[PDB]
Amino acid sequence: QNPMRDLKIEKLVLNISVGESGDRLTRASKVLEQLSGQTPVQSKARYTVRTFGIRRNEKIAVHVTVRGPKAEEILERGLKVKEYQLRDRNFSATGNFGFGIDEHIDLGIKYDPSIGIFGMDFYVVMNRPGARVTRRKRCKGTVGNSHKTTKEDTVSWFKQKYDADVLDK
Amino acid sequence: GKSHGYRSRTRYMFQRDFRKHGAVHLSTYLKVYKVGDIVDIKANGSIQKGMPHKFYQGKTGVVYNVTKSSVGVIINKMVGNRYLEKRLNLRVEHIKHSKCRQEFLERVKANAAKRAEAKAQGVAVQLKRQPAQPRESRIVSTEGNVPQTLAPVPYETFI
Amino acid sequence: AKSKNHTAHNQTRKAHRNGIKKPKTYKYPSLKGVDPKFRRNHKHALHGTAKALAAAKK
Amino acid sequence: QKDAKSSAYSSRFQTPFRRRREGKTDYYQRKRLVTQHKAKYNTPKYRLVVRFTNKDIICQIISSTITGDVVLAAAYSHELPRYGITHGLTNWAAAYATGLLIARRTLQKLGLDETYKGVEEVEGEYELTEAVEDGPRPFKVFLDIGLQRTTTGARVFGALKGASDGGLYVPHSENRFPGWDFETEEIDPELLRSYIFGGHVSQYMEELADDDEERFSELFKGYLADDIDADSLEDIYTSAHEAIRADPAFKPTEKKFTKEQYAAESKKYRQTKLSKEERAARVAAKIAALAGQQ
Amino acid sequence: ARRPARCYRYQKNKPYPKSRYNRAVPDSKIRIYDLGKKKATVDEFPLCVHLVSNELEQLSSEALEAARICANKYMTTVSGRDAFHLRVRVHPFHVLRINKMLSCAGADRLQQGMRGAWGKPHGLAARVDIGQIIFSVRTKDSNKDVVVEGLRRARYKFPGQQKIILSKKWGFTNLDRPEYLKKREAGEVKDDGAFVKFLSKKGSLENNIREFPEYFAA
RNA sequence: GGUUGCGGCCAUAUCUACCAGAAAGCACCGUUUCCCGUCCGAUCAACUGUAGUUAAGCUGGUAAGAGCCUGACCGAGUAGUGUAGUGGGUGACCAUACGCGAAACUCAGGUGCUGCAAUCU
RNA sequence: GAGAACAGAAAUCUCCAGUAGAACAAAAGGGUAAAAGCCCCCUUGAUUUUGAUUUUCAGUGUGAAUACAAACCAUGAAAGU
RNA sequence: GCUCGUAUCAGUUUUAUGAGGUAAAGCGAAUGAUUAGAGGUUCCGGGGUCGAAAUGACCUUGACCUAUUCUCAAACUUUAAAUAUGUAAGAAGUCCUUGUUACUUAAUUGAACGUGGACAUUUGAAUGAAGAGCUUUUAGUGGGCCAUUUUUGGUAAGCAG
C-alpha cells in the first residue's frame, strides 16, 4: 500500500562556486537570477586555506534553491543537456542526486559576451509528503525507515520519469 | 605564588552532576520560603548569580529575609573561638528546604495526638523518645533449623 | 635564617580554653538587612496594632 | 563507522525533559512565566495558554503547582458552533472569539463579571483596563505562546485581543496586531477591526467570487451551502460576540456513552503486553526451532 | 651511570605518570611484553605459572627488561621458542626523579643545596602490590618444571621477594581447568585469535546464532 | 482505556529494527488576496476543513536487543578505614582486638508513573 | 558518511548520524543546546542616590562580588531580564 | 567583678536530616596513557604478478573499523567509603469566627507582628553540668621543638616543609 509515500521533488539547488568575488560573482548571480526567476544568495568561505588560495568570508560561491514546477522544469532542462545518462555514483545513499553541467547556454540562456561561460551544479533533494515532521518547529520528529528516501527507489523513480537510464559505473 | 579566589578549590564542589546538567526543573522555583524556614545550601553550578561561597556549601541556615528571586539565610560560622552570625543572599536554585525540621514538626503533631488520646483515656502514652534498648529474652527453636557446624577453611592460592 | 612558616598547632586548644560556646540567641532578631518595603509595612502595621490594643484595653 | 552508537554513548547520554523531547514546551520561557516573586509568597501566576492545532484553538487559564499545572477555565474553538461560529474555527476572528469566551468564563467563575465588563463595542483600538475606584483589580493573566512564533498579525495575538477586550488585564503591546505598520508606530484600528470581524475572509470571498469561481466552489463550500455572504459573516461574528457575553457558562456534552464503556471498547481493541513466562517460552521456541535445526 | 635501585625501591611518592605535565621522560627499557608463541590458541597452552610479588614496592623498567630477557632466553634454550607464552603483567608507568647537576669537586659553591630541588625525570618503574602478578607463562603441562625454572632464573633480577604459583586457571583465561573444560565440551567458548570468547546467556539470539555456530548446531 | 492542551518527576521515559492502531483527537495534507520572513509559502504568516492515513509523525506491542532503573543472606564482611598494644617483621609491610564498611564475567526483576481541564463504538 | 563539473584528503556540500567530542577575548577549572554557542533587530543598566551583605578578615581597609529599596531607562507581546 | 541561681549549656553519644569526591575501585564507562592477538574495496604510507592496461585475483604497520578487559593516572573519572563536618530534637513551641498595615493579593487571599483561647506533674532522646551570662582592664608571648598517624620535596638525613 502506497497512499502518499510516493517520491516528490523537495527542492533543486543550482550552485555556481566562483573562484573569487567581484565582477565574476555578480555575473554568476545575474545568470542564476535569470535562470531561476529569483535572486540567488552568495556563500562566503567557511575557513581560509593558503594552499587553496581563498580567504575566510570571501563570497566564494553563489547558489539558488527552487521548488515545485520551476524545479521540475529546470531539472528537465539540465537533463536535456546531460542526455539522460546518469550513474549510481551520481545518486546518493539518502535518495538525493545531482549532476554538474558546463556552458549554461545549453540550458537555453541567450549568450552575452560579458557573462561568458559559467558552469554549475544541480542537486535535487528527493522526498515524499511528510518531511514537515522533521522540518517544523513544534513536535519535531524523524521519519520512519518505511518513509525514508533511498538509493534504489530514487533511481527507480528517476528511470521511470522520462524513462532515463543509468550506467553500471 | 598562592591563589585564594572566591571559587578557589571548588572544582568538584560546583560540578553539576552526572547526567543532570543543563536547565533546572521548575519545582525549585515553585517552592516558597518564609522567614524562619530552615534551608540547606547546595550551590547550583549552572546558575552563577547569587551563588553561595564554598564555605556555606552544605550548611543549614534559617531564613531571615525574602526578596524577589532570592532569600536571606542566617548561618553561624566558627571564627576562632566563637560563632559569628553571617547573612547570605542566596538564590532558590542554591537553597533547598531541610527535612530534619519537617520530621520534627510531624513528631510534634504526633505528640499532640498522643496527648489528646491520653486526655481521653490515660494509658501512659510516654511521649519522649528512647534509645535502642538492649534486647529482651527470647527463645530460638530448631524445627528445620538444626545448627549447622562451621569450621575455619584451609588456605588456598585461588589465583 | 629561615623560620617556621605556618602551623595550626595549639590553635584548637587555645580556642577551647574558653572557646566555642554558641552565639547568644534572642527573641526579636534585628530587622537590619530585611527588605525596606517590608519594613515600611511593618512600621505601619505595628503602629496600627498598638493603637488597636490601646483602644481595646487602655 | 557511520552508525556508531556505542554502549558508552548510550550510557553517558543525558535525555532532555520529556516535553522538550516531545517538542511541546519551552522551559527557558516557562521558567520566567511560572517563577513567582518570592515575597509574593504563594499567590498564583496565571498564564493564558493559547495553542493552535489544525481545525481547533485551545485557550486555557492555568496556574502552576508542584504536582502539575492546574486549569482555571478553558475555552475551545470547537464549542463556537454553540454560539454561532461554525465555519473558520481556526482563523483570526475565531481566535478572538474564543479568547473573549475564555475571558468571560473566567470572570464569571471568579465573580468579576459585572465589574470589568471589558469592551463591548470593539473598534480595533489599543486600550488598557483602567483602575476602578475602591474596587478589586482586574484579573491579571500573562499570555503563553509556547513554541509559536511571535509575529505581527498572529492568531495568538488574536486570542490575546479577545481576552483583553473580554476584561482580563493581559499586559501587551499593540505592535504585534494586524494593521500595525512598522514604518509608522501607529496602529490601524480599522484594519484591526476588519480582522476582528473576519474582513480578511470576507474580502477574500469577494475577490475569489469575482476572479476565480472554481476556487470559490472548491473552498468556501460550506459557506456556499449555508448561504453566508461577505456582508453576513460580520453579522454572525457580532452575534457570536453577543451570545458569548450573554452565556459563557460552559455547558459540556453528554458523551453519548459512559466512561466505563469507552474504557471497555478501547481496552479490548488495544494491544496487550506479554507475560514474562510466555516471553521465556518464546525465547525457548526460538532456541528449539531456529537454533536447533529440529 | 644510573642511580642504584635501592634509592627507588619503595613506593614513597604518589604515582607520577608521563602526562601533559611531565611531557619529557625517557623511553621505557622494556618494550616487548609478550614473547614465545603469543599467537597460540587457548587450548594449546593449558598450564599457567605466575611470578608474583610478595612485597609492595617498585620494579624498574631496567629490572623488568633484564628478567624478561633472562626468562625468555632460558625458555628458548631449553624448550624452544614455540613451547610457551610469556607475558609481563606490569607496565612501568611511574616516573622517577633526580636532581643531577654538573659534577665537580667543591661544588658547594654553586650547587644551591636543597633550594629548588625538584627532580627531572630519569627512570621508569612499575608499582606492584602484594599478590600482584609480575610474570605469567602459559605452556603445556609437560613443560611445568622448565617454566618454573625459567621464572626462578628471572626472579634474581628483581628486588624483594617473589613467589612462583601454578594457577588453577586454564592458560590465560579466567576459568579454572574443570570449568573451562566443561564450557569447552559445551559450545560456550569460541577460539578468537589468541584469547577466547564466551557465549553470554544474555544478548540477541540472532547474533548468538551468527556467532557460536557449534553451541546451537548440535 | 484512547487522545489533546498545559504539566510534575526528568531514560522504568532514551536508542536500534520490525509489526499494529477501531473511534475521536493530533499530524501530514489543499491554497496564496490580506498580517507576515527568507534565494526558496520548504520552515515561519495567513485562508479553507472539502479531496487520503498507517505513508510518516504519534501511540502501543515485539527483542535470551544496547542503555537505564530497583533489589540480592552467590560474590564481600572482601578493598578501604577510626581506635589499641613495650604486637610480628631488618625493612617493605603484615596479623590480631574493639567498630564502620565500598564496582563489575555477576544474578533476579522492570522498561514510565502520575496532576488539572477537554473529547472519544 | 554518502556527495558536484573543473575541484583535488583540507573551497563550493544536499541529505544522514551527531550529548556538545564545538564555541564562549585570554590561563586553568567549572558552566551552557528551541543556549550562555552562531546569525539578525533594538539598544546604553558600563546610569543616579545612598545603605545591607559574602570572600580575604582584626570580622580593619583595599579589590571583587551578592540580594534588595527608591528612581530613571533599555529590551520584549509579555512574563521578565 | 557585675546580673542572676541550675538555666538563652557541652572538644560526647543517639535519632532524624544534609553536604563532600579523599581511601578504595574503574578503564569489553568519558579524558589521557597502554600490550598483544581474526576479516576488510591499496581512489586511502611504502614492496611483485595475466602484461602496452587498473575493481575476474595474496602477503608487510596498521591510517580507518570490529566491543575481545595486558597494565595505569597528584593536576582522569560513572561509583564511592571510614574519620571528620552543618542543622534539628519545643513554652521565643504546636493548633482556631480573628485584629493591624500605605506591603502583597483578582479577592480579609497572603506576609509579618499580635489580643483572646487548648496544652501538669514525662515540656517532647542519652550522659554530664565541683554554678550559668559575660563586662572592664592588663601581663607575658608572637625563634619553638618532639611523638604513633596522614603527608610534600629530597637517594637520604638527628634534613626541610
Curated annotation (Swiss-Prot), chain A:
A Pfam family assignment: Ribosomal_L5
GO molecular function, one term: rRNA binding
UniProt keyword list: Acetylation, Cytoplasm, Methylation, Nucleus, Ribonucleoprotein, Ribosomal protein, RNA-binding, rRNA-binding
Signal peptide: none
PROSITE patterns the record matches: RIBOSOMAL_L5
Biological process, per Gene Ontology: cytoplasmic translation; ribosomal large subunit assembly; translation
The record's account of how the chain is modified after translation: N-terminally acetylated by acetyltransferase NatA.
Main location: cytoplasm
Compartments where found: Cytoplasm; Nucleus
Domain of life: Eukaryota
Gene Ontology cellular component terms for the protein in this record: cytosol; cytosolic large ribosomal subunit; nucleus
Quaternary organization: Component of the large ribosomal subunit (LSU). Mature yeast ribosomes consist of a small (40S) and a large (60S) subunit. The 40S small subunit contains 1 molecule of ribosomal RNA (18S rRNA) and 33 different proteins (encoded by 57 genes). The large 60S subunit contains 3 rRNA molecules (25S, 5.8S and 5S rRNA) and 46 different proteins (encoded by 81 genes). Component of a hexameric 5S RNP precursor complex, composed of 5S RNA, RRS1, RPF2, RPL5, RPL11A/RPL11B and SYO1; this complex acts as a precursor for ribosome assembly.
Miscellaneous comment text of the record: Present with 21200 molecules/cell in log phase SD medium. There are 2 genes for uL5 in yeast.
NCBIfam families found in the cross-reference section: PRK04219.1 (NF003258)
UniProt family annotation: Belongs to the universal ribosomal protein uL5 family.
Protein name as annotated: Large ribosomal subunit protein uL5B
Organism, as annotated: Saccharomyces cerevisiae (strain ATCC 204508 / S288c)
Underlying gene: RPL11B
Swiss-Prot record, chain B:
Protein name: Large ribosomal subunit protein eL21A
Gene Ontology cellular component list: cytosol; cytosolic large ribosomal subunit
Keywords: Cytoplasm, Isopeptide bond, Ribonucleoprotein, Ribosomal protein, Ubl conjugation
Domain of life: Eukaryota
Molecular function GO labels: structural constituent of ribosome
Family listed: Belongs to the eukaryotic ribosomal protein eL21 family.
Biological role stated in the UniProt entry: Component of the ribosome, a large ribonucleoprotein complex responsible for the synthesis of proteins in the cell. The small ribosomal subunit (SSU) binds messenger RNAs (mRNAs) and translates the encoded message by selecting cognate aminoacyl-transfer RNA (tRNA) molecules. The large subunit (LSU) contains the ribosomal catalytic site termed the peptidyl transferase center (PTC), which catalyzes the formation of peptide bonds, thereby polymerizing the amino acids delivered by tRNAs into a polypeptide chain.
Complex formation: Component of the large ribosomal subunit (LSU). Mature yeast ribosomes consist of a small (40S) and a large (60S) subunit. The 40S small subunit contains 1 molecule of ribosomal RNA (18S rRNA) and 33 different proteins (encoded by 57 genes). The large 60S subunit contains 3 rRNA molecules (25S, 5.8S and 5S rRNA) and 46 different proteins (encoded by 81 genes).
Gene: RPL21A
Keyword Cytoplasm: yes
Cross-link Glycyl lysine isopeptide (Lys-Gly) (interchain with G-Cter in ubiquitin), sequence positions: 31
Extra facts: There are 2 genes for eL21 in yeast.
Pfam family, one: Ribosomal_L21e
Subcellular location: Cytoplasm
UniProt-listed GO biological process terms: cytoplasmic translation
Curated annotation (Swiss-Prot), chain D:
Protein's name in the database: Large ribosomal subunit protein uL18
Gene Ontology biological process terms in this record: cytoplasmic translation; ribosomal large subunit assembly
PANTHER family given in the database record: LARGE RIBOSOMAL SUBUNIT PROTEIN UL18, RIBOSOMAL PROTEIN L5-RELATED
Modified residues (Phosphoserine): 164, 173, 232
Functional note: Component of the ribosome, a large ribonucleoprotein complex responsible for the synthesis of proteins in the cell. The small ribosomal subunit (SSU) binds messenger RNAs (mRNAs) and translates the encoded message by selecting cognate aminoacyl-transfer RNA (tRNA) molecules. The large subunit (LSU) contains the ribosomal catalytic site termed the peptidyl transferase center (PTC), which catalyzes the formation of peptide bonds, thereby polymerizing the amino acids delivered by tRNAs into a polypeptide chain.
Example of a GO MF term: structural constituent of ribosome
Subunit composition and interactions: Component of the large ribosomal subunit (LSU). Mature yeast ribosomes consist of a small (40S) and a large (60S) subunit. The 40S small subunit contains 1 molecule of ribosomal RNA (18S rRNA) and 33 different proteins (encoded by 57 genes). The large 60S subunit contains 3 rRNA molecules (25S, 5.8S and 5S rRNA) and 46 different proteins (encoded by 81 genes). Component of a hexameric 5S RNP precursor complex, composed of 5S RNA, RRS1, RPF2, RPL5, RPL11A/RPL11B and SYO1; this complex acts as a precursor for ribosome assembly.
UniProtKB/Swiss-Prot annotation, chain E:
Alphabetized CDD domains for the sequence: Ribosomal_L16_L10e (cd01433)
Sequence position, cross-link Glycyl lysine isopeptide (Lys-Gly) (interchain with G-Cter in ubiquitin): 39, 100
Phosphoserine modification, residue list: 142, 204
PROSITE patterns associated with the record: RIBOSOMAL_L10E
One GO biological process term: ribosomal large subunit assembly
Keyword annotations from UniProtKB, A to Z: Cytoplasm, Isopeptide bond, Phosphoprotein, Repeat, Ribonucleoprotein, Ribosomal protein, Ubl conjugation
Region (2 X 15-17 AA approximate repeats): 166-215
Top-level taxon of origin: Eukaryota
GO CC terms, sorted: cytoplasm; cytosol; cytosolic large ribosomal subunit
Sequence repeats: 166-180, 199-215
Main subcellular localisation: cytoplasm
InterPro entries assigned to the protein according to its UniProt record, in alphabetical order: Ribosomal_uL16, Ribosomal_uL16_CS_euk_arc, Ribosomal_uL16_dom, Ribosomal_uL16_euk_arch, Ribosomal_uL16_sf
Pfam families: Ribosomal_L16
4Fe-4S keyword on record: no
Localization per Swiss-Prot or TrEMBL: Cytoplasm
NCBIfam families per the UniProt record, alphabetical: PRK04199.1-4 (NF003239), uL16_euk_arch (TIGR00279)
Subunit organization: Component of the large ribosomal subunit (LSU). Mature yeast ribosomes consist of a small (40S) and a large (60S) subunit. The 40S small subunit contains 1 molecule of ribosomal RNA (18S rRNA) and 33 different proteins (encoded by 57 genes). The large 60S subunit contains 3 rRNA molecules (25S, 5.8S and 5S rRNA) and 46 different proteins (encoded by 81 genes).
Protein name, as recorded: Large ribosomal subunit protein uL16
Organism: Saccharomyces cerevisiae (strain ATCC 204508 / S288c) (Baker's yeast)
